[PDB]
Structure formats: C-alpha cells, structure tokens
Design a protein around this ligand. Structure first.
Ligand SMILES: Nc1nnc(N2CCN(CCOc3ccc(Br)cc3)CC2)[nH]1
Length: 373
C-alpha cells in the first residue's frame, strides 16, 4: 500500500503549537508527500507563498533521510476554483505552455511529480467541455513526462489527481476509464461528506451508511464512493482512499438531541489554532475531549463523535482510522492519503498518544511500519 500525506504551505502561519513547517514532517512516516499548493499565472505553474522555494528545498530535502520517499507538487485546491484550469485547458497552446512549465518546475525544485487538485472539472463554474478536456490535459501531461524521461534519461515524473467524492460531481467531472489509464494514482476525496450546510449532524468521513440514509444520502460514505470509482473504471490498485485528520462541527438546535441526523442551526466554532469556521483539526478535537466533551461512537459508520453544550463534532480517531485501514486492505485498494499531516497531533501534546497518532495508525495498519529509511 501507499501512504500519501498532504502538507499545506499555509500551516506555517498558525499560532504557537499550530505552526507546521516541512522540517516538522517525520521522513519515515509516509511513502509519498504532497506539497499543497502551487498556483498558476499566464498558464504556467507558480509558487503562491513568499517562502515556497525555501520550503520546497526543506520538503524535498526529506528524501535525504528516507531514500524511498517520493514527493509531488499539488496545483490548485478548493479556493483556487476552476477559472485558471478552464482557461488553461481551453486551447492546446495553453496546455503545452502549462505542461512545459510543469516539467521545468518539478525538475528544478526536485519534485517527483504533479498532483492535480482541480476542484472540479464540470462544476463550480467549470463548463461541461472540461470533463473531456481534463482527460486530454492528463493524457498530454503523461505523454510529455514519458517523452522528457527519454530526453534526460531518468525515470519519468509522476502524474496524480485528487478527485471528487460527490456522485453528481463525479458524473459531471470525469471520464473515469480514459482518465484512469493515464494517472499513476487517484486520490479520492472521501471526506466532507456531511456538514452544517445540511441542517443536521452528520459524519465527516463515515465508512458506511447510517441506517436512516436513503436515496441520494445512501451514497455519502467511503465504501460507496470508493466502489463507485472502481465500478466505473478506475483500477483498484490506483485508487487511494482519503483520510481526514480533522472533523466538522455544528451548532445543535437542541442540546438534548445529539445523535446522527439531529437538527443543527449552523456551523460550529472555529478552533483556536486552525481558526476554521465549522472545522477542528484533530489536535483541536483532542482539547475538546480532554476537557470533558461527551464521546459517542457511531457504530453503523465506524466513526466517533463528541458533543458538549450546543457543540457537536463528527471526526476520526485512532479507532476509526484503524477500522478503515483494515477495510481498505480487505478491498485491496492502492492505499491511503491524508488531509493533512499538519492537522494530525504532530507535537503529541494534544492527544497524548504519541506524535502523529492518526498517520502512525495507518502506517502500522498498512504494514508499512518496517519500511526502509
Ligand atoms: N486531496 C485534496 N485536495 N483537496 C482536498 N480538500 C481537503 C479538505 N477541504 C475541505 C475542508 O478543508 C479543511 C479546511 C481547514 C481545516 Br482545519 C481542515 C479541513 C476541501 C479540499 N483534499
């Protein structure tokens, strides 16, 4: 199995114990590390933070401590939106401009490949033609990488992509069989499956359906989503299951109603480190737990939840990560990816379960513990 871990270049700005830099990464923890994010200017890949070049050096420098480690640069992400991708794929000139810049950029800064985080072709403003044009872009990139490898006589750069978990988004976004052919790995974003937008409590990344989930709600679980990708053309071995080291929180409409599907009246409070409306990093959740929040277990879906006063959080812990890792093995998927390494309890001080307790759980469960360094 692979264990692919996203690092975020804005984690550096979190106060005190929240600050996470590339040198905070244990080089022996994951098999692949992904740097989020690069941007785009005039159809060319660019840095986004002032210190990205220095951070690229530290990040890829981790490969000096673990010879097996591969690194990829992620372009795009949620806030990036679709507009620069749409314009870039709109013409073969723009795609070649982009592809050329990517080869040069990855080789210069010592990345082993590119992760596409276009969220998403065919939605969030992206027109219907982008579904096919994404396939075309990925084909042309994979073919350019193959070409370059011949020119410079080295193994080719990798191409991977983060892909939607929502069924409508998948249908409007991807030519699964054709696309799957050209990608090295498919990082399926099996999280944010529920949230306060829905008006009821729900889990972030439930493994299975809750009994009351019917109709389109029956699709909002890891198992359904991973099998949808496989059934519609992605080889199990290229499929990588998304694991979140965070949870969504909610304001309960009634503090006495705390089960799955209890009414909610909005997004729960930002945490004191990540400062994210309606979302707590795992280490932030550990504070909540440590200070007396009531813990629940959602047995049907194999995930924890917790509540206190009017606040309810659906999340993942060591138990739920282990359960999902065993499931992944039973289904023989390619491995796991983690959003994000900087949201795990990297200091060990919040949850008191050792450093990187969630990601270490996956490393152990996936038989990677004896991996080389
Ligand atoms: N592979 C990949 N590419 N893009 C993603 N996702 C990550 C999650 N994201 C919504 C929640 O994002 C936050 C935000 C803040 C905090 Br704290 C925790 C999570 C959407 C984009 N995954």
């Amino acid at each position: 199995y692979q264990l692919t871990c996203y690092f975020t270049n804005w984690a550096q700005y979190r106060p005190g114990l929240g600050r996470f830099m590339p040198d905070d990464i244990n080089p022996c923890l994951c098999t692949h590390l992904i740097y989020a994010f690069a941007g785009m200017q005039n159809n060319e890949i660019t840095t986004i933070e002032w210190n990205d070049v220095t951070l690229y050096q530290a990040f890829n420098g981790l490969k000096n401590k673990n010879s097996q480690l591969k690194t990829l640069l992620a372009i795009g992400g949620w806030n990036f939106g679709t507009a620069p991708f749409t314009a870039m794929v709109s013409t073969p000139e723009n795609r070649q401009t982009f592809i050329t810049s990517v080869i040069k950029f990855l080789r210069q800064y010592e990345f082993d490949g590119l992760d596409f985080d276009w969220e998403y072709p065919g939605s969030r403003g992206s027109p219907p033609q982008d579904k096919h044009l994404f396939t075309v872009l990925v084909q042309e990139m994979r073919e350019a990488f193959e070409q370059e490898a011949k020119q410079i006589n080295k193994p080719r750069l990798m191409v991977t992509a983060a892909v939607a978990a929502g069924i409508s988004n998948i249908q409007s976004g991807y030519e699964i069989p054709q696309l799957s052919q050209y990608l090295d790995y498919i990082h399926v974003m099996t999280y944010d499956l529920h949230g306060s937008w829905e008006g009821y409590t729900g889990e972030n990344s439930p493994l299975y359906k809750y009994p009351t989930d019917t109709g389109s709600n029956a699709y909002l679980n890891v198992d359904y989503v991973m099998n949808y990708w496989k059934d519609n053309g992605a080889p199990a071995e290229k499929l990588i299951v998304g694991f979140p080291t965070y949870g969504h929180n909610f304001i309960l409409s009634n503090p006495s109603n705390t089960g799955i599907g209890a009414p909610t009246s909005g997004a729960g409070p930002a945490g004191p480190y990540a400062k994210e409306s309606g979302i707590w990093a795992y280490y932030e959740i550990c504070t909540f737990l440590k200070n007396g929040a009531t813990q629940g277990w959602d047995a049907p879906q194999e995930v924890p939840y917790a509540y206190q006063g009017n606040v309810w959080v659906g999340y993942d812990n060591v138990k739920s990560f282990d359960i999902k890792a065993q499931w992944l093995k039973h289904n023989k998927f390619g491995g796991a990816m983690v959003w994000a390494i900087d949201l795990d309890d990297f200091t060990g001080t919040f949850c008191n379960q050792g450093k990187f307790p969630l990601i270490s759980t996956l490393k152990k469960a996936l038989g990677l513990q004896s991996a080389s360094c």
